[PDB]
Amino acid sequence: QVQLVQSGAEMKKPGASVRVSCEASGYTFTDYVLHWMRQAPGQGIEWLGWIKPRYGAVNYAHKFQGRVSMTRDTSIDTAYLELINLRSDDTAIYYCARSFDSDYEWWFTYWGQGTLVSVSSASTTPPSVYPLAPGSAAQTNSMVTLGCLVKGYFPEPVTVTWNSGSLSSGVHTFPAVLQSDLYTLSSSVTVPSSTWPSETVTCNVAHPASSTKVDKKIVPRDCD
Amino acid sequence: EIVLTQSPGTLSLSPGERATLSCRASYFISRDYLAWYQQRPGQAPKLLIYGTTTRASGIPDRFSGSGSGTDFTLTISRLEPEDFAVYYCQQYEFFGLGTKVEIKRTDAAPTVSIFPPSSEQLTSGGASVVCFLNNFYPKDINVKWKIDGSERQNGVLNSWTDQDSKDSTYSMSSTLTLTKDEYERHNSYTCEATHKTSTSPIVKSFN
Amino acid sequence: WKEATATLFCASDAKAYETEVHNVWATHACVPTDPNPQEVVLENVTENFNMWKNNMVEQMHEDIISLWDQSLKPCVKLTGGSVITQACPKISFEPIPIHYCAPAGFAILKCNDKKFNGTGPCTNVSTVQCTHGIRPVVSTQLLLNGSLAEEEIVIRSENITDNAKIIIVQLNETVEINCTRPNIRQAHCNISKAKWENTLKQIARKLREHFKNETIAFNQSSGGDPEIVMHSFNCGGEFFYCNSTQLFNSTWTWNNINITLPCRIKQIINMWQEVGKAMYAPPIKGQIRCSSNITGLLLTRDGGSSTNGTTETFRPGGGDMRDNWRSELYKYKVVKIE
Ligand SMILES: *[C@@H]1O[C@H](CO)[C@@H](O[C@@H]2O[C@H](CO)[C@@H](O[C@@H]3O[C@H](CO)[C@@H](O)[C@H](O)[C@@H]3O)[C@H](O)[C@H]2NC(C)=O)[C@H](O)[C@H]1NC(C)=O
Ligand SMILES: *[C@@H]1O[C@H](CO)[C@@H](O)[C@H](O)[C@H]1NC(C)=O
Ligand SMILES: *[C@@H]1O[C@H](CO)[C@@H](O)[C@H](O)[C@H]1NC(C)=O
Ligand SMILES: *[C@@H]1O[C@H](CO)[C@@H](O)[C@H](O)[C@H]1NC(C)=O
Ligand SMILES: *[C@@H]1O[C@H](CO)[C@@H](O)[C@H](O)[C@H]1NC(C)=O
Ligand SMILES: *[C@@H]1O[C@H](CO)[C@@H](O)[C@H](O)[C@H]1NC(C)=O
Ligand SMILES: *[C@@H]1O[C@H](CO)[C@@H](O)[C@H](O)[C@H]1NC(C)=O
Ligand SMILES: *[C@@H]1O[C@H](CO)[C@@H](O)[C@H](O)[C@H]1NC(C)=O
């Protein structure tokens, strides 16, 4: 069984270099071209080049000449990609892949699990968590929408639950947004107005990367 | 160089219907090699069709391929729920920009709601005003921010959700972030959502 | 009409009074050449040939492996958890021509179309008992002591629009390359600068016949093992590795002096036949000199979407010597007799 297993996610600052690995198994490593691709947030898939592992011949995309180096270790059947001069727009999930067929080497049956590479001047930074309760003069309807704003963290991911997961109706979790080399997201929950504030409503935020676990009770607020 | 134009950019079809995806080359690229891939959220793409027409192993019978050698078509004879994903065409190192296949549902109006900045953020020097646009379809929607009656476009960042797995709607967040110095000058903040239900935006405001 | 796998045999005029190792191998392993070889022209067939799916190459490859495996004396061999040391005396080494001959009941079809691109139908077909004499020159980047195209330069590719497929250029005029280790590891090769560049103009135009009105650039190797970044070859048992950068640094558009390449004789090499390294003894003393004929090139085209300039860049590649043999076996296929 052919399998490709890559190394784990990495955080890097602009101008640094990154190394991504790709472990092959289930076949004769030197028999198939290995390609490298990446997928940036919301963009298409980009081919960087390929390496033929038998002699290490390489082919680098025009836009990455001077930026990429591809190598391999045939004694442990592992290939490696080195990227230099990192900049902001190198942020992406990276994949190695190969075709099942040896005549046309672009029928991608076998893919690595992907490696997330985040490039930012920021180091690991915990989020600020802010509650979104209706305004004092906000009109009251039969249902009420509450929210939680999770701003300025790095890296991804966060998880959100509502009343610690015992309410699994009415939850929406929103994609992170870039704003200053850090990610921000928010979460909304909708509950009947008759059940809050008479009973508790809490957003539960978890950011494992910073060992953060926060509960935020939503109570209506009076402006100080 | 091969240029592969995929269409549509977004494909909105009801489950059970047949999907026809288009890939147009900038010159003749033969029938021998063009391939189609599937990608689900959070996964690598998956090879569906190779050599224009041949299904690999495990590919459902509802996928069928055709093409003239320049223009190619992927047919999904009857869309199942798990087939709604992103689809790419490719030959050699060249990829199309993708087609998203999505679920058509009723024209549900958004339950738009607006939330002023918390006092904690103001104490922190920042002021984010947040508008949620919940449970709408179709995906296209416009949000307009207003500050003390003057239209504000700069400093707004928006993020759209994927289709909800249970009720098939979309949701969107809109976040207005200012400094405390600028934010504390103006009084009225308004979020206006436009959806085919309410002709004229849905307005939520605070002072 | 069919490519069938017969066990070929080889034939040569090896001389028993020669010490060169190819002679010893072909003496024990081959028979003498036909003094009066008969060629038969056929019924004006359009037989398909596919130089990229030609079983002769695997068989020829095995022969050179066998030759190399019983003639060459590397001091140390590293092969999958094994490292074998043996005596490693110097040898006398100069390739001889080897003919491949079909056994009883089979024949070799020969393509005689002068512009045959390497794959597809051949219209001027003939049958032979044995191939022409082919020198088994092991090299990269430049093919040495090979066959010339008879009329014009020929570009051959399994599929030229697939940038992952090697490109074999076959010249129609030899360019002489002179390499000397002067009477310990610093050496050099001379090539006419003017003759190489005038050759480049015609190569670029031939390549341009598929990639119409694009500017064609020749550029240095992008990377890999020493075997493929330099021009590598065997001269008198020594392994030369020549910096070929100065050969592949030019641009040619819709529109004598020597190049001396700095070379080094390396003791530690990565083996072409199998994944592993071999160590040979240091060079002999005395003047080492080999004059070879450049007869072709191995090129790889950079892939990817276009940035700005219309420019396609080709860099030498190679390494898998099956393609070296292919550059000579392209016109032959083995067939069973009706
Ligand atoms: C190998 O596969 C290639 C496909 O990559 C087949 O090549 C195609 O051959 C035709 C006829 O020569 C080419 O047509 C012309 O190509 C130029 C290139 O830009 C184009 O601008 C012209 O308008 C015209 O379309 C075609 O481009 C070429 N490539 C593709 C992608 O179609 C080739 O026939 C195959 N060979 C074998 C033996 O299978
Ligand atoms: C070689 O001949 C085949 C026969 O159809 C053709 O398809 C191919 O394009 C030719 N190659 C070149 C480089 O002209
Ligand atoms: C070599 O090729 C060129 C063009 O490819 C041609 O003009 C020239 O006549 C050829 N030379 C010989 C000796 O056939
Ligand atoms: C190479 O040497 C041979 C024999 O001495 C000579 O005839 C030929 O002109 C030389 N060519 C070059 C390019 O050095
Ligand atoms: C040849 O040498 C120069 C500098 O001495 C170097 O920059 C170049 O990469 C070398 N060429 C090859 C093919 O190694
Ligand atoms: C590269 O090409 C230029 C232009 O012909 C030349 O002046 C320079 O010496 C060449 N250098 C190398 C290392 O090939
Ligand atoms: C060779 O490639 C390098 C970068 O890959 C580029 O800077 C240089 O201009 C190229 N030169 C030629 C003659 O192709
Ligand atoms: C090519 O043949 C000549 C014949 O004199 C020989 O000296 C030279 O070493 C040969 N080249 C190779 C690479 O075998």
User: Residues of C with CB below 8 A from B25's CB?
Assistant: none
Domains within chain A, CATH numbers bracketed: 3-119 (2.60.40.10), 128-218 (2.60.40.10)
Q: Are residues B123 and B202 in the same domain?
A: yes
Q: Does A185 touch chain B (CB under 8 A)?
A: yes
* Residue ranges of domains in chain C, CATH in brackets: 9-336 (2.170.40.20)
Instruction: Decide if B164 is inside a domain.
Output: yes
Amino acid at A202: T
Contact A148, A129 (CB under 8 A): yes
Side by side, which strands form the sheet with C40-41? Answer: C40-41, C125-128, C106-111, C332-336
Q: What is the nearest CA distance from C233 to chain B, expressed in angstroms?
A: 33
| Final residue before a domain boundary, out of B71, B103, B135 | B103
SS (H, E, C) chain C: CCCCCCCCEEECCCCCCCCCHHHHHHHHHCECCCCCCCCEECCCCCCEEECCCCHHHHHHHHHHHHHHHHHCCCCEEECCCCEEECCCCCCCCCCCCEEEECCCCEEEEEECCCCCCCEEECCCEEEECECCCECCCCECCEEECCCCCCCCCEEEECCCCCCCCCEEEEEEEEEEEEEEECCCCEEEEEEEHHHHHHHHHHHHHHHHCCCCCCCEEECCCCCCCHHHHCEEEEECCEEEEECCHHHCCEEECCCCCEEEEEEEECCEEECCCCCCEEECCCCCCCCEEEEEEEEEEEEEECCCCCCCCCCEEEEECCCCCHHHHHHHHCCEEEEECC
Which residues line ligand 8 at a C-beta cut-off of 6 Å?
A: C 94-95, 137, 139, 144-145, 233, 235, 290-292
**Per-residue DSSP letters for B115-157?**
EPPPHHHHHHTEEEEEEEEEEESSS--EEEEEETTEEE-TTEE
Residue B72 domain-assigned? yes
Same domain for B43 and B132?
no
Residues of chain B positioned with their CB less than 8 A from the CB of C303: 92-93
What's the total number of domains in chain B?
Answer: 2
The reply to whether B13 falls in a domain is yes
Q: Tell me the CATH number at B57.
A: 2.60.40.10
| B138 and B77 fall within a common domain | no
Domain that holds residue B19: 4-103
Among B54, B83, B103, the domain boundary falls at B103
B122 shares a domain with B87: no
Task: State whether B201 and B156 are in the same domain.
Answer: yes
The beta-carbon neighbor of A58 closest among C162, C224, C227 is C224
Resolution (Å) of this entry:
3.5
What single letter denotes the amino acid at residue C266? K
Report the atom number in ligand 6 closest to the C-alpha of C220. Answer: 14
**Are B121 and B188 part of one and the same domain?**
yes
Cβ–Cβ below 8 Å for C270 and A55: yes
Nearest atom, ligand 2, residue C121 CA: 4
Shortest CB distance from A224 goes to which of B50, B56, B119?
B119
Non-local (6+) Cβ contacts of A113 within 8 A are A4, A5, A6, B44
**Residue B183: which H helix or E strand, with range?**
helix B180-183
Asked if the C-beta of B92 comes within 8 angstroms of chain C's C-beta atoms, the answer is yes
Start-end of H helices in chain A: none
Q: How far is the CA of C123 from the centre of ligand 2 (A)?
A: 14
> What ligand is nearest to the CA atom of residue C312?
7
Judgement on whether residues B127 and B153 belong to the same structural domain of the protein: yes
Q: Which of B82, B103, B124 represents a domain boundary (last residue)?
A: B103
Task: Return the best residue to mutate from C245, C263, C266 for the ligand 5 pocket (most ligand atoms within 8 A of CB).
Answer: C245
Structure tokens at A104: 């046309």
Structure obtained using:
X-ray
In a domain, B108, yes or no: no
User: Are residue B122 and residue B61 in the same domain, yes or no?
Assistant: no
